[PDB]
């Protein structure tokens, strides 16, 4: 088990850790989060009591170093930082635990939710989408735009998702216009899987990270990226059978974890109706179709 201590909590803020969250009061003696499960990525995220817009947060992996949080009164945000002095850090952690000023990562032992949402997400791939290589952890917020969004302004702050475009030369082989546009299999399997992602796990990984950014940060272009990567698979007549079954599990747990009140801002009607009911793979997402119908029949 690992720990992310907090120096202080000077401003009222709702703190998220993965799918859990806690309200902390201005200058409440809060000093961090303990018992964080090793083995998966994690995200710690903040919504100030006074700015209900701007969500923001840090993706990290406790194996890659000792990380803590410190409010910066100049820039006005809780900042993640790395402590290189291992001894100094165990010392801070131990003292705060002794004083019991830390909340416990509240995992139910039956619950594989976070594993299921993060199965293919790897810290190394996150740091390629969020390029800032002086840090081991990755800052994402509500306002950050994607590279594809930027092509249609500041590139240092961009989400470098892999660009998917169904009406591009990349996606359409000359002489197979109609075929490739109606049946994206060659774009999925040769261009994206074999070409760019190298394997389905990296693709699922980006798909999942995009989802999480979409629902935890309210990041619009992440939601666009998640839907595009779903649509590419569902609009391909030829998908490896192992990908279809893994996809149905992946989407099931994403829909399951979805805030019911944001179902209409986070799920694109067209894409979902096409994947579940029109596409080549309409019959291959039974678990996903069953939870969508019982929980959001309106969207369909």
């Amino acid at each position: 088990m690992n720990t992310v201590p907090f120096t202080s909590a000077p401003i009222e803020v709702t703190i998220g850790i993965d799918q859990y969250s806690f309200n902390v009061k201005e200058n409440q003696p809060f000093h961090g989060i303990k018992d964080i499960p090793i083995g998966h990525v994690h995200v710690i995220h903040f919504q100030h009591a006074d700015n209900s817009s701007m969500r923001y947060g840090y993706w990290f992996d406790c194996r890659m170093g000792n990380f803590y949080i410190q409010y910066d009164p100049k820039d006005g945000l809780y900042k993640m930082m790395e402590e290189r002095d291992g001894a100094k850090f165990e010392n801070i952690v131990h003292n705060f635990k002794e004083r019991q000023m830390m909340v416990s990562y509240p995992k139910i032992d039956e619950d594989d939710t976070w594993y299921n949402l993060t199965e293919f997400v790897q810290m190394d791939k996150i740091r390629k989408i969020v390029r800032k290589d002086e840090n081991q952890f990755s800052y994402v917020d509500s306002s950050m735009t994607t590279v594809q969004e930027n092509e249609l302004s500041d590139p240092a702050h961009s989400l470098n998702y892999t660009v998917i475009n169904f009406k591009s030369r990349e996606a359409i082989r000359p002489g197979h216009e109609m075929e490739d546009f109606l049946d994206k299999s060659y774009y999925l399997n040769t261009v994206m899987l074999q070409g760019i992602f190298k394997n389905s796990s990296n693709y699922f990984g980006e798909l999942q990270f995009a989802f999480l950014n979409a629902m935890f940060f309210g990041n619009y272009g992440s939601s666009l990226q998640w839907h595009a990567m779903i649509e590419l698979i569902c609009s391909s007549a030829t998908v490896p059978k192992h990908m279809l079954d893994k996809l149905d599990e992946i989407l099931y747990y994403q829909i399951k974890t979805l805030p019911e009140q944001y179902s209409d801002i986070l799920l694109n009607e067209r894409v979902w109706n096409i994947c579940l009911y029109s596409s080549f793979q309409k019959n291959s997402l039974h678990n996903t179709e069953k939870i969508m119908e019982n929980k959001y029949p309106e969207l369909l």
């Binding site: 009406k167 216009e177 109609m178 546009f181």
Partner: protein, 237 residues
């Protein structure tokens, strides 16, 4: 953007543009089989690609053989149209390639766009206008060349005959759409009006009779007149 009544005079500026209509590309007759089921037989069709400023018509004849052994023919029709439009633009010298292509039916957008990926600077646009180009096969000489064709074939026409020697593009296009509208809503009567007088002939290199200016005025009034009578009959107004 979409083409509508507001931005209608843009048709007659000096930016090259083409209208593409696919309504006559895949044509069938429906008939009964010996066992009493229904079957279609295809007949030859055409892509109606028109420069509204110049009157140049690129009538690409679609021979039934194109359909042989193919499924989902109405969907394929849209892709074949786009493939042929694209081939037409590639065939044209650079200074003659259009800056816009305006499809008369929105279902052509994705196919043309995909086929025109090599021409990112050509804008594919829909239209909100209700253009009567489907009636192009009511023009006897165009129907005749389509139906006689034994192979794919491009045939070039000026759909304005020599009118531009005497009227603007704006006026020529209004006359053409008026005639085609009339031919659409009541072919028999429209054709009667055009040909009633045996002393007004069609030149061998023309599509329409050689009306004088005053006779065109009368003809247009007769066409107007027909279209509003028909609207009266059709809506019991």
């Amino acid at each position: 953007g979409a083409m509508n009544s507001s931005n209608y005079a843009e048709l007659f500026n000096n930016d090259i543009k083409l209208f593409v209509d696919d309504t006559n590309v895949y044509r069938v007759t429906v008939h009964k089989t010996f066992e009493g089921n229904v079957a279609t037989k295809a007949i030859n069709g055409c892509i109606f690609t028109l420069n509204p400023k110049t009157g140049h018509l690129f009538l690409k004849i679609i021979h039934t053989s194109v359909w042989a052994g193919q499924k989902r023919l109405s969907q394929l029709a849209k892709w074949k149209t786009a493939e042929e439009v694209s081939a037409l633009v590639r065939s044209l010298p650079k200074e003659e390639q259009p800056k816009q292509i305006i499809v008369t039916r929105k279902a052509m957008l994705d196919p043309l766009e995909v086929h025109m990926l090599d021409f990112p600077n050509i804008a594919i646009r829909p239209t909100e206008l209700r253009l009567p180009f489907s009636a192009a096969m009511s023009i006897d000489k165009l129907s005749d060349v389509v139906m006689k064709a034994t192979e794919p074939q491009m045939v070039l026409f000026n759909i304005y005959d020599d009118w531009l020697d005497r009227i603007s593009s704006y006026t020529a296009f209004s006359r053409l759409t008026l005639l085609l509208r009339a031919l659409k809503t009541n072919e028999e009567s429209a054709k009667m009006i055009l040909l009633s007088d045996p002393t007004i002939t069609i030149k061998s290199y023309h599509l329409w009779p050689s009306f004088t200016d005053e006779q065109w005025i009368t003809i247009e009034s007769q066409m107007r007149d027909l279209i509003l009578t028909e609207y009266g009959r059709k809506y019991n107004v």
